Short mmCIF file of C-alpha atoms in Angstrom, two decimals:
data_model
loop_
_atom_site.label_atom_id
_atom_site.label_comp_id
_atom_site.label_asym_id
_atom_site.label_seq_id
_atom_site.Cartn_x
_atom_site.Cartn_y
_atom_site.Cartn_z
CA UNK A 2 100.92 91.33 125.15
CA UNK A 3 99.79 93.17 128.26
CA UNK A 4 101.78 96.32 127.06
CA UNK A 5 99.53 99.82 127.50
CA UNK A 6 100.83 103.67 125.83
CA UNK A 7 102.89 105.26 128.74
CA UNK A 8 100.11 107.43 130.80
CA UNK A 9 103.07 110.54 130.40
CA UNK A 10 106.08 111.11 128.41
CA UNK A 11 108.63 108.66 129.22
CA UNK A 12 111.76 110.75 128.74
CA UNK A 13 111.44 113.83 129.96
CA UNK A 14 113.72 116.94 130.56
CA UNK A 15 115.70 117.55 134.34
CA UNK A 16 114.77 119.68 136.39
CA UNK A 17 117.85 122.66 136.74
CA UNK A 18 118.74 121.09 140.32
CA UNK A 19 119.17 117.48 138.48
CA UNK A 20 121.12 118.84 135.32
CA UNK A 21 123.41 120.41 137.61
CA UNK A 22 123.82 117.40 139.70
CA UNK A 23 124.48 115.41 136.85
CA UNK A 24 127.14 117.70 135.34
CA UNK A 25 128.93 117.85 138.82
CA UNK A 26 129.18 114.39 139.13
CA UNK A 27 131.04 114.11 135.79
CA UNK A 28 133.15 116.86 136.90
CA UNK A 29 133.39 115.58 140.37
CA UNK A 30 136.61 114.51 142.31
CA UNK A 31 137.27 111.20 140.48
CA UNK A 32 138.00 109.80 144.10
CA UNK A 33 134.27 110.40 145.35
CA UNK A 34 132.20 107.14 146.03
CA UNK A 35 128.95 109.34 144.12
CA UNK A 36 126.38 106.44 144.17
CA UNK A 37 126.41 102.61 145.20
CA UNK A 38 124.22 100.16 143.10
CA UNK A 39 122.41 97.35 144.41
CA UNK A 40 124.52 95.46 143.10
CA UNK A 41 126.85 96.88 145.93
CA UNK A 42 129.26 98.41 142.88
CA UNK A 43 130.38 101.79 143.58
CA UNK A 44 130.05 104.13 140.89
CA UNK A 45 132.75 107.24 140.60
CA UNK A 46 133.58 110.00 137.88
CA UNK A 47 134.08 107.25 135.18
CA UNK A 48 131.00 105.56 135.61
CA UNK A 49 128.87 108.78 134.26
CA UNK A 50 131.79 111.16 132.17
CA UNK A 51 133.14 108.21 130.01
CA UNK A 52 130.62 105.40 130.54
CA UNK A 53 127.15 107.26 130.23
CA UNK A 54 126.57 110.69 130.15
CA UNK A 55 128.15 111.26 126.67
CA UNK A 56 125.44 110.79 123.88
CA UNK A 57 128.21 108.31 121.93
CA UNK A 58 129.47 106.65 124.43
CA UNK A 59 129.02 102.49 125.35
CA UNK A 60 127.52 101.82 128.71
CA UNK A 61 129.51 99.85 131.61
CA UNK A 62 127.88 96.59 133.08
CA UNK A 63 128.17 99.19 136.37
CA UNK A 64 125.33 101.35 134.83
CA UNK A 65 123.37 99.11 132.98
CA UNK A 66 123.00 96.54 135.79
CA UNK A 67 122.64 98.85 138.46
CA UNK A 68 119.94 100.79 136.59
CA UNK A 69 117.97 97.67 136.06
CA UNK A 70 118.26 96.22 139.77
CA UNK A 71 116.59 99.65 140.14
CA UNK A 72 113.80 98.55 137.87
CA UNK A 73 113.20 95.20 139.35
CA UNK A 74 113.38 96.72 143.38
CA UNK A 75 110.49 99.38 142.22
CA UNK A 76 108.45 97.18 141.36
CA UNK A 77 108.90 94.62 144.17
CA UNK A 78 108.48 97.77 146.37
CA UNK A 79 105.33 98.91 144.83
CA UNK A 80 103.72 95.38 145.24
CA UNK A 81 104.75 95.09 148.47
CA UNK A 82 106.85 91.43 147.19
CA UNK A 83 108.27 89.74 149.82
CA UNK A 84 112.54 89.15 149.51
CA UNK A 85 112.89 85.91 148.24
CA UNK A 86 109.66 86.32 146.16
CA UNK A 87 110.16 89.34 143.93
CA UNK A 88 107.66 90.05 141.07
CA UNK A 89 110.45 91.53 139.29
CA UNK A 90 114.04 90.26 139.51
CA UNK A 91 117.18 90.87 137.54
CA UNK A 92 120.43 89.31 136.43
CA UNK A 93 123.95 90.49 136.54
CA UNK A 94 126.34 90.43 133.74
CA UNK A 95 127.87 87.32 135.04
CA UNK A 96 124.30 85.00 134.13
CA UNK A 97 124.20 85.34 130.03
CA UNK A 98 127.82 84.43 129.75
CA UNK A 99 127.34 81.36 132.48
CA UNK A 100 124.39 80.09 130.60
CA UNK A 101 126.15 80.27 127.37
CA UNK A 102 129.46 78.37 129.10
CA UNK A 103 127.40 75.89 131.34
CA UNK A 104 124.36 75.51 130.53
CA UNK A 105 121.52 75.79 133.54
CA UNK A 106 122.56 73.38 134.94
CA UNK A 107 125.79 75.03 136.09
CA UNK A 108 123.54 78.50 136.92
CA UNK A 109 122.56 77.69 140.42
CA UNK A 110 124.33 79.93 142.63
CA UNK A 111 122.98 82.89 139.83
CA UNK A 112 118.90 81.63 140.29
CA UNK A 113 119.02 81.56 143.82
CA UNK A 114 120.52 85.16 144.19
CA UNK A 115 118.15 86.43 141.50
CA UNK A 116 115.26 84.30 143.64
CA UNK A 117 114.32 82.18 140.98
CA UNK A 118 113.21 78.81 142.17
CA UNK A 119 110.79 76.15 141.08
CA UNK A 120 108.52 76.95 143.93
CA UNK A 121 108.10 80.52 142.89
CA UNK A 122 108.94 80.95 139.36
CA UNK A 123 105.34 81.08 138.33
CA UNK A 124 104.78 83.76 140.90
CA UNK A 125 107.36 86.20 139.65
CA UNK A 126 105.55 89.09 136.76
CA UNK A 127 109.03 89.86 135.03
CA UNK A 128 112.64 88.47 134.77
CA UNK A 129 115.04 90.84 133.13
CA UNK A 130 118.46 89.37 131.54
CA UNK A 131 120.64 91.64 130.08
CA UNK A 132 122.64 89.92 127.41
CA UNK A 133 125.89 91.51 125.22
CA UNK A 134 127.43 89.44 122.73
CA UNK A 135 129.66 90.80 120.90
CA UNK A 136 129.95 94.41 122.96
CA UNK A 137 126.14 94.75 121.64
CA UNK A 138 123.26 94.97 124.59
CA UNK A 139 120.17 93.47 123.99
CA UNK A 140 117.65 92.19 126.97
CA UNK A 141 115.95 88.73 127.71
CA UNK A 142 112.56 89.08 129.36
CA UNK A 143 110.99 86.35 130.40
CA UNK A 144 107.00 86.71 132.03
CA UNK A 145 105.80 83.74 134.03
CA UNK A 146 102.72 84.44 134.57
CA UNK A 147 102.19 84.48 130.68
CA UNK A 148 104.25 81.64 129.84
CA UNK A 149 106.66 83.37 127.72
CA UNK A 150 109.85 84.24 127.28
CA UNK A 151 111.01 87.49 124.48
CA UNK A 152 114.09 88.72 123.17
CA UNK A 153 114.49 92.22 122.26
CA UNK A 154 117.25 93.24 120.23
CA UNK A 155 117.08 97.16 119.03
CA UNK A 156 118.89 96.27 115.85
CA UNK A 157 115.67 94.74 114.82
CA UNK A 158 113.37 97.18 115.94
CA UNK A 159 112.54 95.03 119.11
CA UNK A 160 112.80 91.41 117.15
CA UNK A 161 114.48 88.61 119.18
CA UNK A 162 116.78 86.21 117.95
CA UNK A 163 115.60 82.27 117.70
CA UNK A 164 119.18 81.45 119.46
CA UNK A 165 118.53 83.89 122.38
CA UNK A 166 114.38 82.47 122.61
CA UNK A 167 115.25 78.30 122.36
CA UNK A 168 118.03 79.35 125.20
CA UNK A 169 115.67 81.14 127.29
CA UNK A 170 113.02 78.29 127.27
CA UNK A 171 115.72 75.27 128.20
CA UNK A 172 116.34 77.67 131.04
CA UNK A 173 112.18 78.15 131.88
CA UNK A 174 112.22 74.10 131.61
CA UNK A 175 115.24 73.59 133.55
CA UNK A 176 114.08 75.43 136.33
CA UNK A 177 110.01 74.11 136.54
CA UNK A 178 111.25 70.29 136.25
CA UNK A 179 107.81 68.53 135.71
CA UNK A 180 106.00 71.73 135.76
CA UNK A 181 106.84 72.56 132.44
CA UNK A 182 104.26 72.39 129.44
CA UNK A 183 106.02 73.00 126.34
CA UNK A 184 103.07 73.50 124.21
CA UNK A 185 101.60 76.04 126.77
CA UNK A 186 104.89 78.70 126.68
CA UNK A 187 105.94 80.37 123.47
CA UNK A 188 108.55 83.00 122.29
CA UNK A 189 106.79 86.38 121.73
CA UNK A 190 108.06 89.48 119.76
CA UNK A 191 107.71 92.55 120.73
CA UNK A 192 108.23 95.75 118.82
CA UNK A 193 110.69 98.21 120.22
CA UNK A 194 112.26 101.63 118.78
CA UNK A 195 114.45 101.17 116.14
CA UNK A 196 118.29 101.70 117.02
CA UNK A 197 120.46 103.15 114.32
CA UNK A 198 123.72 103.91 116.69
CA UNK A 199 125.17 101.32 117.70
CA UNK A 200 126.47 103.22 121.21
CA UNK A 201 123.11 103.32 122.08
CA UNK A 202 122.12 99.65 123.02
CA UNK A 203 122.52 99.80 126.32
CA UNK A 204 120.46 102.64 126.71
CA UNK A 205 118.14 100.78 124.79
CA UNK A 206 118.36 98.15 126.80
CA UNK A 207 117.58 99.81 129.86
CA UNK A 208 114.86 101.78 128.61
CA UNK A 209 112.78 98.63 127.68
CA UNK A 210 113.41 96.93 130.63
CA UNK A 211 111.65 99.97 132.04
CA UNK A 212 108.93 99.24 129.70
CA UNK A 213 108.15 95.51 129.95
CA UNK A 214 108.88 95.96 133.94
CA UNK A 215 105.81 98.39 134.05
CA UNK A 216 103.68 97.13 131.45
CA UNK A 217 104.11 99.84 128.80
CA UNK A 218 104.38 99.84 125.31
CA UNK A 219 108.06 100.46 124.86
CA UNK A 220 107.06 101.22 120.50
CA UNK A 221 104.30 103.89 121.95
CA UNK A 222 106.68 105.51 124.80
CA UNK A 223 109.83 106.56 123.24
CA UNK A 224 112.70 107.29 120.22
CA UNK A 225 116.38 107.00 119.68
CA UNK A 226 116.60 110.80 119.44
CA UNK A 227 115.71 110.78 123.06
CA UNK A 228 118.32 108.86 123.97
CA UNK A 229 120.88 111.65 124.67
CA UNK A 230 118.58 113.19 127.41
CA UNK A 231 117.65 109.61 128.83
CA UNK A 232 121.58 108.83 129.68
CA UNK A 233 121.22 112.16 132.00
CA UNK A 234 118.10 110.75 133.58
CA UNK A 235 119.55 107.57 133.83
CA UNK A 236 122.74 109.28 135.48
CA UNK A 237 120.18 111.06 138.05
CA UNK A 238 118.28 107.88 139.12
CA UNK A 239 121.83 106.61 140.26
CA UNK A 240 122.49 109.78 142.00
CA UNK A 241 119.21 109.39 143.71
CA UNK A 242 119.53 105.61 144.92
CA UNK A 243 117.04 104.31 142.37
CA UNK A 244 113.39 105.32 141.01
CA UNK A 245 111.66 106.84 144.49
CA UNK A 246 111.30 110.00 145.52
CA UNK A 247 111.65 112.52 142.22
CA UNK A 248 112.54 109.64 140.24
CA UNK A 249 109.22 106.91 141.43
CA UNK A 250 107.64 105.28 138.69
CA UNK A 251 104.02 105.66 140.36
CA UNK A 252 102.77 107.82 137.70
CA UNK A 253 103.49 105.10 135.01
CA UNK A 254 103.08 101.96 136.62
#
């Protein structure tokens, strides 16, 4: 599995200086550019007072993708990865719903901005798909270097669904052409917190990308109670341009 216990606690009370932050940019002038993703999507007053901050409210594809390019560019920072060879790359919003209308074959243009090509697919740690179907979140991981491919859906305590998993391995053999050995991948479970709230899945979602992109134990690391105070973190690593500085994952990775 390759998963260890979180070295600290994963979610973790602000600072005063970040609290306040985050409360003034869901009071802030709804005009202010506050943060741009790497995505290049600005994020305003919406983005955090309607779309994430509140404890019962549904996450925007502006957060949820912008916090996980976040995830994917620590880690290609941290290992030094060079542009078009991360060891961590992410998909937009736009891949689940092309894969489900076209089929790989029509994905492309989507690989080749996420830098996933034959030549270096096998090089890359961790690919992170976010997936919603249905307005629920749930996140696609697949691991080269192990040969497998997971999907983990919070409704079932981490469980994947055999739809998601036969999808994600016509898109591992699609991609590696005659470097593809069936018998040598396989569709792994993994167990995950337990949602109950249904508003919650994209903080879900984002919290086990965090885990599978570092290596931890997402079951070990966290619980759905926590989930109020890991919207406001969330909220502060956008403020902050991503997981560096206050915000590095270092002392988890």
């Amino acid at each position: 599995s390759g998963l260890r216990p979180p070295a600290r606690q994963l979610i973790t009370p602000l600072s005063e200086e970040w609290r306040s932050r985050v409360e003034a940019a869901r009071n802030a002038n709804p005009a202010t550019e506050l943060a741009k993703t790497l995505e290049g999507q600005p994020l305003v007053r919406r983005d955090f007072e309607e779309k994430l901050l509140p404890a019962t409210a549904w996450l925007n594809d502006n957060v949820i993708i912008g916090a996980i390019f976040y995830i994917a560019d620590y880690v290609n920072t941290k290992k030094g990865a060079p542009n078009q060879e991360p060891k961590c790359t992410a998909f937009t919003s736009f891949f689940w719903p092309r894969l489900l209308s076209h089929g790989p074959g029509g994905c492309g243009r989507l690989l080749r901005r996420a830098n996933v090509r034959k030549a270096n697919f096998l090089d890359i740690d961790t690919i992170l798909i976010p997936i919603c179907e249905s307005s629920h979140w749930t996140l696609a991981v697949i691991r080269p270097g192990r040969r497998t491919v997971s999907h983990l859906d919070s409704m079932a305590a981490g469980r994947g669904s055999e739809r998601v998993k036969a999808k994600l391995l016509e898109l591992v053999k699609f991609v590696l052409e005659d470097q593809f050995v069936e018998a040598e991948w396989q569709a792994v479970d993994f167990q995950a917190p337990r949602q109950t709230n249904g508003w919650d899945c994209g903080v879900f979602t984002i919290t086990n990308a965090i885990c599978l992109a570092l290596g931890v134990d997402p079951a070990q690391a966290y619980t759905e109670a926590q989930l109020p105070l890991q919207r406001q973190r969330i909220a502060a690593v956008l403020l902050n341009g991503g997981f560096k500085g206050d915000f590095t994952l270092d002392d988890l990775h």
